């Protein structure tokens, strides 16, 4: 007779579930044609090299592959909390054939697209380079997409993070079913190396104060912290030596993360368009914070280009009430075999634990992995490798140069780490 919250069983737990979804590219002039230079504006005049209705290579996404991808999603039978979503939804054509309002009536079909699939889902965007016309040109102060993703976005988001968003395209925002749990969207794009509006800014938009400011908030608040942007911070590893950000900044933005190492308790990005890990490290390699690039839901490529991947969406198991991130599951769609008979069979590329024997996702756990791919014919890298392109290519190989630049990336995100593996390791 006395009102105590009821008690529940002695069961574990349930592990929380979120989902990563980005890089959408939806391309509307997507058609099947005889001519198959018209299939698709965003292969810029190619042809398209065996086009269905999902899509083709050297396209970005038909709308009927990105309605598929959050099916899948919403049929999957996983029980999740949230979803992050760290942007790109225009695609790659000219900037001629964009503008403003079509790069924001882009964004208003994806972000439509997923409220009215998932209505009671609180979903976290991030803005990506391609979410701004011109492309990469993101600006410090308030702008018609910034406002205009304010209030797409407003659903999702409250006064404070609507405000910043407005101003900067960055905002952070409580988790309203994880309490203790706040996600910081950043505007990575802010740093990328195309971006003229941020040429000789030290601290463009006060995005870096304002992170400092978040933090310092959340670490004497006892949160826990998820990052999300579009960018990564690091190296490609696919290329010697180049940061994914301006090397100015992405120095900057990682000594930010190692002070707060202990509050950050995941890092999650897209941009690249493949499937990668990073550990972030101190100086002595002492592992710190755990990274995830997310793929692409669009295949496309380049004609350059050898390799794509197949589309992507993924999956984290979290600790709840503590935020410490358990699994990675990736799922993936086989983009021949669905053209071939018309239907998508959106499926699980792996889960990380089961994978590569892990325990869990710790920086300790994953260190201890990517110091395994450094060996000599490393089964765990050729997998990882493998994983990299979605499945695209089990034939794929990555020779002694492309394996340096790999592990180099994985393991070494700051400049002064990663020329010393180059030095120790070409
Ligand atoms: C996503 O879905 C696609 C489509 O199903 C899968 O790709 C197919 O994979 C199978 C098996 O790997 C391929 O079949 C094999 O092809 C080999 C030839 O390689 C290329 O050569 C021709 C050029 O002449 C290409 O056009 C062709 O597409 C291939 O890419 C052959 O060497 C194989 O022959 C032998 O294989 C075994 C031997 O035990 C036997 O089954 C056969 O009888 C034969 O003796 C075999 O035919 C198939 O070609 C692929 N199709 C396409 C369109 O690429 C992906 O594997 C799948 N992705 C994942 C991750 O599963
Ligand atoms: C785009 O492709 C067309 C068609 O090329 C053919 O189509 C494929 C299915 C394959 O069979 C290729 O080997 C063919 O060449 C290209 O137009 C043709 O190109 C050659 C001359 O270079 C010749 O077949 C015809 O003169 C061209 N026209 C047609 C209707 O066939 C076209 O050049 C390609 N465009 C680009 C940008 O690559
Ligand atoms: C989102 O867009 C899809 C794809 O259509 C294109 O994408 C938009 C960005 C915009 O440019 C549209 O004018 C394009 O047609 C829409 O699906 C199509 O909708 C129209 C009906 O208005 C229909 O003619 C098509 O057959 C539909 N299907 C496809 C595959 O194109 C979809 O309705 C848009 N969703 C929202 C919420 O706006
Ligand atoms: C980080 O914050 C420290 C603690 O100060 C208190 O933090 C919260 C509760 C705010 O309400 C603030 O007003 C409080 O005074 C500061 O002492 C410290 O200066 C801050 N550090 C940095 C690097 O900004
Ligand atoms: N694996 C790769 N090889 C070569 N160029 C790439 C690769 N991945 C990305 N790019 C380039 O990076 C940009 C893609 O990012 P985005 O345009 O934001 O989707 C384009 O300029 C691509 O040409
Ligand atoms: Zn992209
Ligand atoms: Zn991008």
């Known amino acids: 007779h006395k009102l105590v919250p009821l008690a529940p069983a002695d069961r574990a737990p349930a592990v ?14 997507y058609h099947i044609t005889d001519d198959r230079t018209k299939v ?66 882009v964004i208003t079909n994806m972000t439509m697209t997923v409220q009215n699939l998932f209505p009671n889902l609180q979903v976290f965007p991030a803005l990506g380079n391609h979410d701004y016309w011109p492309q990469d040109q993101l600006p410090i102060v308030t702008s018609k997409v910034y406002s205009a993703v304010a209030d797409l976005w407003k659903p999702w988001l409250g006064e404070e993070a609507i405000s910043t968003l407005k101003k900067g395209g960055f905002y952070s925002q409580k988790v309203a079913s994880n309490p203790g749990l706040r996600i910081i969207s950043l505007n990575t794009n802010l740093y990328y190396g195309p971006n003229i509006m941020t040429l000789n800014k030290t601290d463009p938009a006060n995005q870096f104060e304002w992170l400092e400011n978040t933090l310092n908030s959340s670490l004497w608040n006892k949160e826990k912290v998820y990052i999300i ?47 990668s890990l990073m550990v972030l490290s101190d100086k002595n390699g002492n592992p710190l914070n755990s990274v995830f690039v997310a793929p692409a839901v669009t295949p496309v490529k380049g004609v350059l280009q050898k390799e794509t991947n197949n589309p992507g969406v993924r999956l984290f198991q979290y600790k ?56 000599k014919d490393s089964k ?47």
Request: glycine share 6%; proline share 6%.
């Open 16 to 29: 929380g579930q979120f989902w990563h979804v980005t890089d959408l590219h939806l391309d509307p002039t």
């Open 40 to 105: 698709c504006a965003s292969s810029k005049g190619a042809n398209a090299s065996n086009p269905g209705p999902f899509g083709d290579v050297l396209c970005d996404s038909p709308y009927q592959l990105i309605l598929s991808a959050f099916d899948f999603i919403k049929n999957s039978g996983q029980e999740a909390s949230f979803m992050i979503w760290t942007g790109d939804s225009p695609p790659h054509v000219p900037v001629p054939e964009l503008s403003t309002g079509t790069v924001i009536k």
């Open 320 to 375: 709840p009430g503590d935020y410490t991130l358990l699994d990675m599951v990736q799922y993936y769609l086989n983009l021949t075999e669905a053209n071939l008979k018309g239907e998508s069979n959106w499926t699980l590329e792996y889960v990380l634990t089961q994978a590569y024997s892990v325990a869990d996702l710790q920086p300790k756990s994953l260190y201890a992995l990517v110091q395994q791919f450094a060996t």
């Open 229 to 275: 942007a579009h960018v990564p911070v690091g190296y490609l590893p696919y290329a010697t030596d180049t940061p994914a950000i301006r090397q100015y900044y992405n120095e900057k933005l990682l000594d930010i993360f190692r002070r707060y190492s202990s509050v950050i308790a995941g890092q999650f990005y897209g941009h690249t368009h493949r499937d």
């Open 380 to 426: 765990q890298f050729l997998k990882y490798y493998h994983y990299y392109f979605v499945s695209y290519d089990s034939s794929a190989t990555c020779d002694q140069h492309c394996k340096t630049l790999q592990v180099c990336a994985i393991m070494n995100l700051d400049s002064m780490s990663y020329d010393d593996c180059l030095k120790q390791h070409l």
